[PDB]
């Protein structure tokens, strides 16, 4: 039964490759015995005695010495030793593998209403994964007495089934996992709650740990069963325990993409707005006012605050007075828990500061305070990021005005370099390099121009025209670290520039157009080279990093903190790692 | 519940011969190919001095 001959469909059978090698060594031994009996000449005795050794070696592991035997299908047979080695073998395949039971998998969707410890669960997969628990509770409940009874009553989905299911999973956490599991945050525990439909929902604030996005990724889900297990998942594995990353103390649940857009948007300022310079006593006042529709949310007002603040040394001193704030920021005053100073919210709130808020909260106020704060931060950022209707047209991408002449200068200098060459007055390689530098510097200039061409807007405000920070869409999407970077803006409004042929040696013709303006056939063709190269380079890496982390896990798989103190008195000497130009790490 | 098979003439466990270094070779203090020749019925070798 480790080399079976089970019959399967088509009235046929499925031997194992071992049966054949056995069936060969056997009758070779038999013929050998018959020969030794009949007293044959020693030549054929030798031939049999050698054929036997060959079959034995094939059985043990064929291919070690010869041209390993094959069956009709002409495959090299799967010998004995070939079962306990290799990735498809026996050790790292079925001893650390083990397709398990009580599991399921489907497509993920967002569900921005949950809390940081919940997840949607299609009632079908729930009915399936918990079925025996349902059986037990029905039997004990007195609605069925046998097992065939309960199985026949669940097959037709009685109404009481849904209620008893919902009470089964009141506090029975599950696990969730995404396929390439690189770090321990690749697995966390949530508490389900029934949903209709056929897709898993998970709180958005964790899609950074699982490194997931909703273009089709599918997650698996396993259930714990025991009393120790489904308590170990609760205490060591629930999402509300994993705030900071094991790699570095930096938090991992910071708002990410347009939770940041809304915050940064409602936390800016404007000079001449409605209701400017007004007076308000408390947050509820500003709320009542703003809902009435008279004030502009970016206005500057004066709020009188009074609340405790925690000092470094465990003190807690009172803070009061009048502070010059903005209508927007005061709207965030409600969520800040008592214990943190208002000085955190009283700025423009780009991402690097939201993370600051969360870190500060954790280190002084606790852990639960931080998850509740992130709750409210998401709940608010989502709200105000749609009353602002941010969107993106094409006129929001503004081409700078001096582009044509800035190109003319460059191409004229290029003609001059070609002149210096054509009369053999200059060599080749130097011409090439100087052309490269020409195009590079001019592209840099035309790129730096659109920054001022899109991040500044002048207006003849009452009295005169003064320049102010623009409220442009595409500028805000990247000055708030929400989603973007300066380079993409360049390639949208500026010019592409230098495209490296496969090696990396730049092409002596740069692309002068840009995406808002489109490209000619040749200009697109020149880019597809690097496009394909960079695209192919990831797929031909995805196996390498896994290789290295596998090696490393092997090297140190058995390092465990076992004792409080080792008592010794020797270590190392640390110092700020200067690099002749900067400290770069204090 | 295993079984077994009776071998008329003994036969060398391939592993301890072609595992590099060959434990048979290291034991008998001879180079491998010299052993395989004996094994492949290509020479003889003094067993009785």
């Amino acid at each position: 039964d480790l080399r079976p001959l089970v019959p399967i469909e088509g009235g046929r059978f499925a031997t194992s490759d071992l049966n054949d090698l056995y069936r060969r060594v056997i009758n070779r031994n038999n013929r050998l015995k018959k020969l030794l009996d009949l007293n044959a000449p020693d030549i054929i005795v030798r031939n049999e005695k050698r054929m036997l050794q060959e079959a034995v070696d094939a059985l043990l592991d064929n291919g070690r010495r010869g041209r390993a035997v094959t069956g009709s299908n002409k495959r090299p047979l799967k010998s004995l030793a070939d079962m306990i080695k290799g990735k498809q073998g026996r050790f790292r395949q079925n001893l650390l593998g083990k397709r398990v039971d009580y599991s399921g998998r489907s497509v993920i969707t967002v569900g921005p209403s949950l809390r940081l410890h919940e997840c949607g669960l299609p009632k079908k997969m729930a009915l399936e994964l918990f079925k025996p628990f349902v059986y037990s509770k029905l039997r004990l409940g007195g609605h069925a007495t046998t097992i065939k009874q309960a199985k026949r009553m669940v097959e037709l989905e009685e109404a009481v089934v849904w209620d008893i299911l919902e009470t089964v999973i009141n506090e029975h956490p599950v696990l969730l996992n995404r396929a390439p599991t690189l770090h321990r945050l690749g697995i966390q525990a949530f508490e389900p709650r029934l949903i209709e439909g056929k897709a898993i929902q998970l709180h958005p604030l964790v899609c950074a740990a699982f490194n997931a996005d909703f273009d089709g990724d599918q997650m698996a889900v396993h259930v714990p069963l025991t009393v120790e297990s489904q308590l170990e998942a609760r205490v060591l594995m629930m999402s509300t325990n994993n705030i900071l990353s094991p790699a570095s103390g930096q938090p991992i649940i910071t708002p990410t993409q347009d939770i940041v857009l809304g915050l940064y948007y409602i936390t800016r300022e404007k000079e001449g707005a409605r209701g400017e310079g007004k007076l308000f006593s408390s947050y509820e006042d500003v709320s009542r006012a703003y809902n009435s529709g008279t004030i502009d949310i970016h206005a500057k007002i004066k709020l009188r605050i009074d609340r405790q603040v925690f000092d470094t040394k465990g003190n807690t001193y009172n803070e009061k007075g009048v502070v010059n704030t903005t209508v927007g920021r005061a709207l965030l005053l409600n969520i800040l828990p008592e214990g943190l100073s208002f000085s955190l919210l009283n700025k423009v709130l780009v991402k690097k500061e939201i993370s600051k808020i969360i870190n500060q909260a954790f280190r002084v106020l606790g852990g639960k305070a931080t998850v509740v704060l992130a709750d409210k931060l998401m709940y608010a950022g989502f709200k105000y990021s749609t009353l602002s209707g941010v969107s993106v047209g094409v006129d929001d991408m503004t081409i700078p005005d001096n582009k044509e002449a800035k190109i003319e200068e460059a191409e004229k200098e290029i003609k001059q370099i070609t002149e210096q060459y054509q009369s053999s007055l200059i060599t080749e390689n130097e011409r090439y390099n100087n052309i490269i530098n020409i195009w590079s510097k001019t592209s840099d200039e035309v790129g730096a121009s659109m920054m001022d061409a899109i991040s500044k807007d002048t207006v003849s405000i009452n009295g005169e025209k003064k320049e102010i920070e623009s409220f442009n869409s595409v500028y805000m999407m990247a000055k708030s670290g929400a989603r973007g970077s300066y380079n993409q803006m360049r390639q949208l409004a500026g010019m592409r520039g230098l495209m490296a042929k496969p090696d990396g040696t730049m092409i002596e013709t740069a692309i002068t157009a840009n995406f808002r303006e489109g490209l000619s056939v040749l200009q697109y063709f020149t880019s597809t080279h690097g496009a394909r190269k960079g695209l192919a380079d990831t797929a031909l890496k995805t196996a390498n990093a896994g290789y290295l982390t596998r090696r490393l896990v092997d090297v140190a798989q058995d390092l465990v903190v076992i004792e409080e103190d080792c008592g010794t008195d020797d270590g190392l000497m640390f110092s700020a790692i200067v690099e002749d130009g900067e400290v770069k790490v204090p | 519940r295993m079984g077994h098979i009776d071998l008329v003439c003994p036969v060398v466990h391939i592993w301890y011969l072609k595992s590099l270094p060959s434990r048979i070779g290291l034991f008998l203090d001879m180079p491998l190919k010299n052993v395989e020749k004996v094994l492949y019925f290509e020479s003889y070798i003094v067993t009785d001095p």
Binding site: I43, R46, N47, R50, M51, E54, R65, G66, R67 | K33, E36, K37, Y40, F41, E42, S43
Partner: peptide, 18 residues
């Protein structure tokens, strides 16, 4: 000749047609 060739069929044909 006795030149390390492993596959037995030759090591038999050689002596066979001697």
């Amino acid at each position: 000749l006795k030149g390390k060739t492993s596959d037995p069929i030759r090591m038999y044909m050689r002596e066979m047609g001697i």
